[PDB]
Ligand binder design. Sequence first.
Ligand code: FES
Length: 106
Amino acid sequence: SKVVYVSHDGTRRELDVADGVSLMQAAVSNGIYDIVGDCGGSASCATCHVYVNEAFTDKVPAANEREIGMLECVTAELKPNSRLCCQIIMTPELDGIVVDVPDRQW
Ligand code: FES
């Protein structure tokens, strides 16, 4: 799947994430996950605070109730379609997904 990561400084990094892989898995491989995953990707923290283009949020597997509670624990401003990276599974059909990462993810 074509995955685009929009950093805070504006630098964009695009990777290929295979089916069943989490945007978090491909990030650690392209040097993008340097967000110090607290739960280590076990979906138990809010360090993976990112913004998924509202166009893939209602398409990729609806975030689980564990993310909603961790989403209220983020350090930056939440968005109506705000999402995390360790609870989303990429797929070829959803290729073109745009992920927006802020300057405050803690
Ligand atoms: S990396 Fe910990 S909740 Fe996503």
